[PDB]
Design a protein around this ligand. Structure first.
Ligand SMILES: [K+]
Ligand SMILES: [K+]
Ligand SMILES: [Mg+2]
Ligand SMILES: [Mg+2]
Ligand SMILES: [Mg+2]
Ligand SMILES: [Mg+2]
Ligand SMILES: [Mg+2]
Ligand SMILES: [Mg+2]
Ligand SMILES: [Mg+2]
Ligand SMILES: [Mg+2]
Ligand SMILES: [Mg+2]
Ligand SMILES: [Mg+2]
Ligand SMILES: [Mg+2]
Ligand SMILES: [Mg+2]
Ligand SMILES: [Mg+2]
Ligand SMILES: [Mg+2]
Ligand SMILES: [Mg+2]
Lengths: 127, 182, 51, 72, 141
RNA sequence: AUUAGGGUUCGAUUCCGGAGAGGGAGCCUGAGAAAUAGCUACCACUUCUACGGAGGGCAGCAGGCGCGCAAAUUGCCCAAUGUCAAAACAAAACGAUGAGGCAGCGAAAAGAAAUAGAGUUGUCUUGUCAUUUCAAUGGGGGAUAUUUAAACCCAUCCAAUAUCGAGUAACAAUUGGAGGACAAGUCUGGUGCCAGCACCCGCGGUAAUUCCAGCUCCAAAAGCGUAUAUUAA
């Protein structure tokens, strides 16, 4: 055992270009032998941005990372959109919330249900 | 409700609960292979009974029967791949001669002990459950892991283990922390 | 007559269980039994003489 | 089937006799089914005659077949 | 001797059907007379109220006073005799206590030297009688 | 389910089919209903009222009350699977959905799997006993974090400059048994046909292989008894 700085390497598989949704689809697996814990998604996003030479790191969407039993590996799914505008248009709201730019949470669904059921008794401007 | 995840049992209890010959024989196996409970032996018993039941059905069929050819080939392939039968014996009749020690010798606990990585079968058991044994660079913590012949040469200490190429274990680390405080 | 219910159990002198070191559990216990029975007419609980 | 009764008007009852196999006892039973069949006046079947019947639309409460051929 | 003909299935079916009623276990399993006579009504257990503590003498050659209680079932208001199954456990029982009663192991048949007793007490006041006997739980109230 | 084979038995319950929406009837609209979170009437039950009057249908989901031997949260969400629909997603601009999914509870059942491992010296080759020394690991505490709709589990880690922890490892395994069937005591106290055990045969009336206890031993083991059905026997 020799102490050394923990360095992660990014490998992609099952790569596909999805021109319908203006993005690239692939499976990303990370080898982190001496990493203490789990590799945060932000670091993997930066390394994928450097690897694929996409101009902006925020164009990369990552999710569903599973750490392999025993350590040293982590496999997830990645998306690289053609531009940031395309990522904001096509990504689901919860993934955009993880990346930072997401819609504010809606009010509790029970409150909406109760308001809707009260209005069904009303009629006109009162509703 | 509306969950379709199948599951099945893997062992059965013996018909006669108190048979001194069976109790002594099972006590021998438990001590010899370091087994936790009789359920591990009975799990091996069901595996053997299913294999022999399949073999007896196939051996009934004519030797040129397509089902016998396909499934007989698969059964022999499985026995050879997992080391139950040696490569010398290739007939379907040799599957019927398999015994409980044949399967138990293929457990990772026995293989680790026989390989010299452990001093005893009990040392092998705790080594496996403590994430020290790796098969093809993959840490295996299951003692009942049946080792294939191909994977037998790839068994060694885990790279993340203190006995392999990993950091120091708990007692050394705690002692170092105490020394730093002291 | 229902009056003598529990007569013997109440008559029995109370003796507390002795404090003893714990036995091993699980696999280690079977190792102990294997070492006692083997690697060492057979009587498993042969007792001292009495009358 | 075989003609069983010709008592109705332009209608006959035929009987289809068959063997039903009981799996447990590996043996057969004799069973029969009776059908009401419309008989055209083109035929004059008698009891015991064998006829060929074809399926048609419901012509009455019980009639679903028509006599197509009579074999003495 | 029996029929053996190739087309003699109906005879064999009728013969077996007629002779199955000779089997007491089969007849009981396919007739409601035992179910209607069963105080539990086909249930594994039943809950009842203790009416009276009684002493049932053991049958010869045994000689003892088997401590039993008279129980009226909640479901159908039928009276049964149930045995209290341990040493001194009759003191855990009181009149008007709610007890859980089970079978005695022989499926409606009297068990042991106890005359015509086919039930035993397993819980009293919603706590296991054997747990009280071993002092693993305390009698409520 | 059980099963050499033949059979025996279960199927309210996820999929398909049918039927019902307290009990009956009748009907409108509509392509399709004899619809019930549609209407009409009667019966039973029942709610509000200012007494003139007006309502209700959980065998949907949660929840109650009863009934019973007997069966969870008045939770979160539409992220996935679908359905409907004027509807792709986005942009002041987020469709509904107790279908469904996710968590809570849950020893029905199923899978894996801890409760220690290596020696040291001495004592009574192996094997016991004492002590005595090394490592190792989880249970658990946490995190740059990961997961997830969000959380929670599971996985990863205890430095990557830099990260908590076993010795009585008190982090202490139980459930039944020890005459026979049936594996395991001709042990020691107590009781004395009593108390009690005992599925059956039987034990107990002063020296109990069977009760109540203690010790020791046996079987299965995170499981083990009991009752009732059922299959084999
Ligand atoms: K949805
Ligand atoms: K004695
Ligand atoms: Mg059904
Ligand atoms: Mg019913
Ligand atoms: Mg249901
Ligand atoms: Mg309907
Ligand atoms: Mg209706
Ligand atoms: Mg409703
Ligand atoms: Mg109505
Ligand atoms: Mg409900
Ligand atoms: Mg229950
Ligand atoms: Mg639902
Ligand atoms: Mg932990
Ligand atoms: Mg989950
Ligand atoms: Mg014996
Ligand atoms: Mg004595
Ligand atoms: Mg468990």
């Amino acid at each position: 055992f020799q102490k050394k700085k923990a360095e992660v390497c990014i490998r992609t598989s099952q790569f596909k270009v999805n021109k319908l949704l203006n993005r690239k689809q692939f499976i990303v697996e990370v080898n982190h032998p001496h990493w203490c814990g789990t590799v945060p998604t932000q670091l993997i996003r930066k390394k994928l941005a450097t690897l694929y030479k996409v101009p902006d790191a925020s164009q990369v969407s990552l999710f569903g990372f599973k750490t392999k039993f025993g350590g040293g590996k982590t496999t997830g799914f990645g998306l690289i959109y053609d531009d940031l505008a395309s990522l904001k248009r096509f990504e689901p709201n919860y993934r955009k919330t993880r990346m930072g730019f997401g819609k504010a949470r809606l009010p509790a669904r029970k409150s909406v249900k109760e308001r809707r059921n009260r209005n069904k008794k009303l009629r006109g401007k009162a509703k | 409700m509306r969950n379709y995840n199948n599951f099945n049992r893997v062992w059965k209890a013996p018909r006669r609960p108190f048979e001194k010959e069976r109790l002594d024989r099972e006590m021998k196996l438990c001590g010899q292979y370091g087994l936790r409970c009789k359920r591990e032996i009975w799990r091996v018993n069901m595996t053997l009974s299913k294999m022999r039941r399949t073999a007896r059905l196939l051996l009934t069929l004519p030797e040129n029967h397509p089902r016998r050819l396909l499934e007989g080939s698969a059964i022999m392939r499985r026995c050879h791949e997992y080391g139950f039968l040696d490569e010398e014996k290739d007939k379907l009749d040799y599957v019927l001669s398999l015994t409980v020690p044949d399967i138990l010798e293929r457990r990772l606990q026995t293989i680790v002990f026989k390989a010299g990585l452990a001093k005893s079968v009990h040392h092998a058991r705790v080594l496996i459950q403590q994430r020290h044994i790796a098969v093809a660079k993959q840490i295996v913590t299951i003692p009942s892991f049946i080792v294939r012949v191909s994977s037998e040469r790839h068994i060694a200490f885990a790279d993340a283990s203190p006995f392999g190429n990993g950091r120091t274990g708990r007692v050394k680390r705690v002692r170092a922390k105490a020394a730093k405080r002291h | 007559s229902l009056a003598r219910a529990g007569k013997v159990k109440n008559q029995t002198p109370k003796v507390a269980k002795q404090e003893k070191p714990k036995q091993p559990r699980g696999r280690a216990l079977k190792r102990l039994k294997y070492t006692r029975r083997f690697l060492s007419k057979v009587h498993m609980n042969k007792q001292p003489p009495g009358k | 089937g075989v003609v069983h009764s010709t008592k109705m008007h332009r209608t006959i009852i035929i009987r289809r006799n068959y063997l039903h196999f009981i799996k447990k006892y590996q043996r057969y039973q004799k069973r029969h089914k009776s059908l009401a069949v419309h008989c055209s006046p083109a035929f004059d079947p008698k009891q015991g005659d064998e006829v060929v019947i074809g399926q048609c639309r419901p012509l009455s409460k019980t009639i679903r077949y028509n006599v197509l051929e009579v074999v003495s | 001797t029996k029929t053996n003909g190739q087309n003699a299935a109906r005879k064999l079916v009728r013969l077996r059907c007629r002779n199955r009623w000779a089997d007491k276990g089969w007849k009981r399993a396919h007739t409601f007379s035992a179910r209607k006579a069963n105080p539990f009504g086909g249930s594994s257990h039943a809950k009842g109220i203790v009416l009276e503590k009684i002493g049932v003498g053991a049958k010869q050659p045994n000689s003892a006073i088997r401590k039993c209680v008279r129980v009226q079932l909640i479901k159908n208001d039928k009276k049964i005799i149930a045995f209290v199954p341990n040493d001194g456990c009759l003191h855990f029982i009181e009149e008007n206590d709610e007890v859980l009663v089970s079978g005695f192991g022989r499926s409606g048949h009297a068990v042991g030297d106890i005359p015509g007793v086919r039930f035993k007490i397993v819980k009293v006041s919603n706590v296991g009688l054997y747990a009280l006997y071993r002092q693993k739980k305390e009698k409520p109230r």
